[PDB]
Amino acid sequence: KCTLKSFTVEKGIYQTSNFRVQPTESIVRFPNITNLCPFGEVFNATRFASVYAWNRKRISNCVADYSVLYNSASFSTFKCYGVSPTKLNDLCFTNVYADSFVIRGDEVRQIAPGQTGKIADYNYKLPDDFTGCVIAWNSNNLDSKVGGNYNYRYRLFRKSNLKPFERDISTEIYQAGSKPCNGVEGFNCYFPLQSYGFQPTNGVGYQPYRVVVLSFELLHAPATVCGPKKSTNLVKNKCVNFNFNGLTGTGVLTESNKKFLPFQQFGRDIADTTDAVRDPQTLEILDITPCSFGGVSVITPGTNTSNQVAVLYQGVNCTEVPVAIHADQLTPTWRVYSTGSNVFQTRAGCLIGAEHVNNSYECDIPIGAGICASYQTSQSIIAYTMSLGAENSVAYSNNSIAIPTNFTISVTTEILPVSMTKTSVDCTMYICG
Amino acid sequence: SALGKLQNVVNQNAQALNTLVKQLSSNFGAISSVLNDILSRLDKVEAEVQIDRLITGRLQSLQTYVTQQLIRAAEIRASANLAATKMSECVLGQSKRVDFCGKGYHLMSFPQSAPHGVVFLHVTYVPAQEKNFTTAPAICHDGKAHFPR
Amino acid sequence: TMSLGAENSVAYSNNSIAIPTNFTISVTTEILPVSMTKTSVDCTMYICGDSTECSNLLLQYGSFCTQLNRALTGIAVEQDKNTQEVFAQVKQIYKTPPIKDFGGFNFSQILPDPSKPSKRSFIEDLLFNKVTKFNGLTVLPPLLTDEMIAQYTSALLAGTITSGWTFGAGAALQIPFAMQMAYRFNGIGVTQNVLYENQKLIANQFNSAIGKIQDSLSSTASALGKLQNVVNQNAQALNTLVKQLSSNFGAISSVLNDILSRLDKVEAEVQIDRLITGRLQSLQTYVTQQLIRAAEIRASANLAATKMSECVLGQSKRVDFCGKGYHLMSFPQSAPHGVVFLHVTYVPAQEKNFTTAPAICHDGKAHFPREGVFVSNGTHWFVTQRNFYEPQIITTDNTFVSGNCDVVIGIVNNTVYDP
Amino acid sequence: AYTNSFTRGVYYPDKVFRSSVLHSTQDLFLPFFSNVTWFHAIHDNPVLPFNDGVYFASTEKSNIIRGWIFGTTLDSKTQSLLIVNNATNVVIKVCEFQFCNDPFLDVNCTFEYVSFKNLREFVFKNIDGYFKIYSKHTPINLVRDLPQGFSALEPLVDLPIGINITRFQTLLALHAAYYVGYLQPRTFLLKYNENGTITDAVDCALDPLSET
């Protein structure tokens, strides 16, 4: 009735809903690690690097807790790209990389994917598709050593622009003048590092700021940096919700006969989705098998005739269908439709509430693969193999003929559609009006 | 239910028009289904972001209807060409084509009009009351073989 | 440069006719699609797949998803109808007598074989050998199994052999097969004695032509390319619809759980709506091509239902409708997604040239042939039937008079015999 | 001197199991039927360019070749990758120093790791500072040249060492023959069998039939 948007239902078979076996529990699995990541040495280094020669550290083989960063009031920005920072304690990574330096406050504007300005062009470049977070804060109270702190340095020309994550150290003179400068200064021949005058009295845009940038290695290999999340025991051969290493979903987890090669960590379908995993705690190879599914064709006489009903669970086996009652999640779900007195395995799927019969009749409601159903005598929806017609051995012999001695003049009615309703639409009045 | 072909041609075109009308109630991701809500709540630069989601969805909703009616018109036209052919061969003639103008050997047909269609009353000779006989392909007489004309 | 064919100057002149002196019975194969694979797509499980977050965005699109299910259900239901219109033309399951005494014609390769697991004929079993996912996409079984289709082809064939035309027009009337062929000869304008005088030769030509078809099917399976396309196009269309789940459409990932696991809802809804729009356009493109393809298959089922009625249940006067040469008879054999007709035809085979004349002067009267043509061997005049050389003496039995000699052009002087 | 590569130099693109499928990918591959340069154990052994990535192989009586140096310049002035088998282990390091300068072992390093009848094959490539190693090992009947038939290499190791490699040299150990070619960007079509294994490959850009 809710499929057809109607209170009356006429006789037939209707594709109402899609039964799926449901997640019984949530299963969580992560690598065997407890040792904390070195975030204090990242965020509280005594002096941060010069932005021409910025620091970069690989983080691996550890447990993080990004709340210790994200919920600290100590930061002037915490901007992230491709991840909402809330998710960082659930999600996890093969490695993380922390880049770090001091910069002028006006130039923090340049520290983003695809941003433009002298530092972004010549001495610190993020790729346009960066995944991760930029953390920066004012450091005028630490890094403004009276005024002449020209150890903090950057670029403006030299030769050519900078690639994403390209390190540089080089010391050849700027040749902005036409002359081959050959290590000697002149008009437009000059020293190849520009520098900052960090006085503690500077206006905020001219003040120093400390920077950390986190890039996250979401590659397909095993995870080694993960959040404070706790694993469960494994479940097999029953439908469950899951999370392995941050790969979430619902499935019947099982042992697998798939020969993964030693470096293969996951299996994938044509549709890009995962179908198999290696357990990070057990090292066993497991199918993330889809929980079994099938269209719920509901078979009915007219509601004009009876409100008794049968259900075909399409494709599924009568041994596998587990619903029984609304304790499994709502579609047919009324308290008999998986384990009743009459249940029958058609090749189209498990047929329940209909009563199998050894006769054959002309096909009333078609079910499929030679099976039909009808409402008959104390009434029930019977189900049977369809009759093709009455059987007849023609009385053939090499010298016998039958000749008709009489006739009948039949009148037969044949009905044909010839034309349909001539509609017209004003699309500006339909769309806008 | 005998006129189920003609009544289904009424039902399909009513179901298609009612479906095209109901799609005016959909948001398609705008703040409202109603164009005058968007234009009364929002100022031009911010309103034109919402209105273009309704144009996107309503134009796709109408292209779906016209594509479906172009396919359905070709189904009706195939049946109109068959009805025009049964008019010529069954009514204006007598047909030798087996089961074309109804079951049995064709004698005659009469057209009747009906809403959106045509009905043919096909008149046919159907044989009745068989009897068995012995039979042979030819007769010998004076040593000649005789065959029936 | 392609050649259109061999060039041929027909030997026309105002008084020369060629009459065939012999024939050949040829059996030829026509293959037709009848019904493609039934499918249905649960569009919510295709587009979203077990995300409630996605499903509540898909509700903003209203009835787009239910009218796609409705269209696929209409396509699926008519595949059973197409199969019903073609095969269910027989009201009773006729069965063959226990003794196969059909006058020298040998149907054993097209009649059912009880040694098969499903009781197909030998040629049906060749035809079945020569013709070769969890994402809410599904395949539905047909209503009639291949064993039920083989019971209909068996009954259509058993009625045809034992009763001719008559099982189509009324109750099946038994008739001897050699007499049935003599009336099917009489329907092509060849006098029925031509069959009884040549019955052994006609039977050997028929039996050998059925023999060649086994060898053809066992060697050049490329003939089934019409039915093999129904398989290839449906498989190619489903593979295209499945692979399109791996496309980004401009979202951060093709995988919906990446979006939902890396992002909070205000950001995630923007990414999911790109996937919903691309996957909905992907499914609309599939269903539209399947509606156009279903009309192409329906036109082929209406043609195959017409060849069943007009050529299996009858004998056809329509030129080249049921094989080349004058149609005698046809037999249906089932095949995957289709039907095969084995059309049996008469081809005239050994031409001979003759002088001819439109009319003959006797006693100043002009005589014309009742049936047949006047011809001469140079020294005598005869009347023959048109499609086989059988020369007869010209008499008042085989000729009729109209007017005097003077009106006709090309009339000639010869005596007409009076019995 | 030259010899041909044939269908050699195929390796696994990703750490993903796939069963019974044809899968298309673009990566740095040795193009089919390209040449390799050939060398043997005399004096045949100066520094070579690395280009975008190296295919290396050697044909040996008891494995006389024992390693390589890679870097910008191999010069004692900046960090240069070393890979050596030292009988007991595979040993890997990134020192500047020419401590064994010549193409044999005479029997500030920021990173370290420790684990003609025979043919050995290897692929070396660098991706955003991650350096990847693949290999294959087999006896062969063919006296010198590369074997004219399909076989995939498998991954050994990834080093996240970040070196700007443009040059390299091989190392023997002393008190064999070898050949070198270069990877190029190619779209390949790859045949995964039932058992997660790439069993055949088509170099799509090779000829009209490969495009077909």
Ligand SMILES: *[C@@H]1O[C@H](CO)[C@@H](O[C@@H]2O[C@H](CO)[C@@H](O)[C@H](O)[C@H]2NC(C)=O)[C@H](O)[C@H]1NC(C)=O
């Ligand atoms: C790798 O080596 C190349 C030179 O072989 C370096 O290229 C220079 O890069 C700077 C920017 O960092 C440009 O301004 C220069 O014009 C480049 N020179 C040339 C000749 O192209 C590159 O910096 C090196 N990368 C690393 C990470 O060391």
Ligand SMILES: *[C@@H]1O[C@H](CO)[C@@H](O[C@@H]2O[C@H](CO)[C@@H](O)[C@H](O)[C@H]2NC(C)=O)[C@H](O)[C@H]1NC(C)=O
């Ligand atoms: C008509 O054509 C058939 C062949 O299609 C001729 O039959 C053959 O006749 C020869 C002897 O002349 C026999 O050896 C063959 O076995 C026959 N073939 C078959 C298939 O039986 C027939 O003789 C021809 N008749 C005329 C008058 O030309």
Ligand SMILES: *[C@@H]1O[C@H](CO)[C@@H](O[C@@H]2O[C@H](CO)[C@@H](O)[C@H](O)[C@H]2NC(C)=O)[C@H](O)[C@H]1NC(C)=O
């Ligand atoms: C009808 O034709 C078939 C072949 O199409 C004949 O088959 C032979 O049948 C006999 C037994 O009757 C066997 O000894 C042969 O081995 C069969 N031959 C083959 C090639 O299978 C069959 O005899 C014919 N039937 C009649 C009544 O003539």
Ligand SMILES: *[C@@H]1O[C@H](CO)[C@@H](O[C@@H]2O[C@H](CO)[C@@H](O)[C@H](O)[C@H]2NC(C)=O)[C@H](O)[C@H]1NC(C)=O
């Ligand atoms: C034209 O046909 C006639 C009749 O069939 C042929 O004449 C007969 O020829 C045979 C021997 O060939 C004789 O035994 C008959 O007595 C002839 N009958 C008559 C009535 O003459 C005649 O030979 C044929 N002509 C040609 C040129 O073929």
Ligand SMILES: *[C@@H]1O[C@H](CO)[C@@H](O[C@@H]2O[C@H](CO)[C@@H](O)[C@H](O)[C@H]2NC(C)=O)[C@H](O)[C@H]1NC(C)=O
């Ligand atoms: C057919 O025979 C008739 C006579 O039986 C021919 O008619 C004669 O033809 C000659 C020559 O032209 C005339 O002199 C006679 O007066 C005609 N007689 C009659 C009774 O008409 C006629 O020409 C012959 N036709 C052919 C084609 O030979």
Ligand SMILES: *[C@@H]1O[C@H](CO)[C@@H](O)[C@H](O)[C@H]1NC(C)=O
């Ligand atoms: C940095 O130092 C402060 C105290 O000065 C401390 O509260 C904070 O936890 C440290 N940072 C990290 C990432 O632990």
Ligand SMILES: *[C@@H]1O[C@H](CO)[C@@H](O)[C@H](O)[C@H]1NC(C)=O
């Ligand atoms: C992981 O840890 C569990 C205990 O938490 C231990 O039993 C298991 O052997 C470990 N597995 C691996 C692969 O280290």
Ligand SMILES: *[C@@H]1O[C@H](CO)[C@@H](O)[C@H](O)[C@H]1NC(C)=O
């Ligand atoms: C449906 O109900 C009507 C009365 O409302 C009744 O006349 C009719 O017989 C019923 N039809 C069936 C098929 O039960």
Ligand SMILES: *[C@@H]1O[C@H](CO)[C@@H](O)[C@H](O)[C@H]1NC(C)=O
């Ligand atoms: C249904 O499942 C059982 C095992 O639980 C199996 O024996 C049976 O053959 C299956 N039926 C079908 C139709 O596959």
Ligand SMILES: *[C@@H]1O[C@H](CO)[C@@H](O)[C@H](O)[C@H]1NC(C)=O
């Ligand atoms: C139906 O037929 C089977 C054999 O096919 C038989 O075992 C069974 O008892 C029959 N049931 C009834 C109710 O006749």
Ligand SMILES: *[C@@H]1O[C@H](CO)[C@@H](O)[C@H](O)[C@H]1NC(C)=O
């Ligand atoms: C014709 O005669 C045969 C004699 O066996 C009999 O089987 C058959 O039923 C008869 N048919 C009719 C129409 O009387």
Ligand SMILES: *[C@@H]1O[C@H](CO)[C@@H](O)[C@H](O)[C@H]1NC(C)=O
């Ligand atoms: C019929 O006669 C003409 C005479 O020129 C000849 O060209 C042609 O080939 C002949 N055909 C046959 C079948 O004898």
Ligand SMILES: *[C@@H]1O[C@H](CO)[C@@H](O)[C@H](O)[C@H]1NC(C)=O
């Ligand atoms: C046929 O053509 C010839 C010339 O080729 C002519 O003499 C003759 O009169 C024509 N036949 C008739 C019936 O006139």
Ligand SMILES: *[C@@H]1O[C@H](CO)[C@@H](O)[C@H](O)[C@H]1NC(C)=O
């Ligand atoms: C291989 O080297 C030879 C020179 O010895 C050259 O002529 C040939 O074109 C090269 N072939 C390929 C495919 O690189």
Ligand SMILES: *[C@@H]1O[C@H](CO)[C@@H](O)[C@H](O)[C@H]1NC(C)=O
């Ligand atoms: C280590 O090597 C680099 C050259 O690549 C050099 O710049 C650096 O100063 C060296 N470190 C020490 C401590 O000498």
Ligand SMILES: *[C@@H]1O[C@H](CO)[C@@H](O)[C@H](O)[C@H]1NC(C)=O
């Ligand atoms: C190989 O190198 C390791 C240290 O990298 C060392 O322990 C071992 O003794 C070396 N073996 C030889 C034979 O030098």
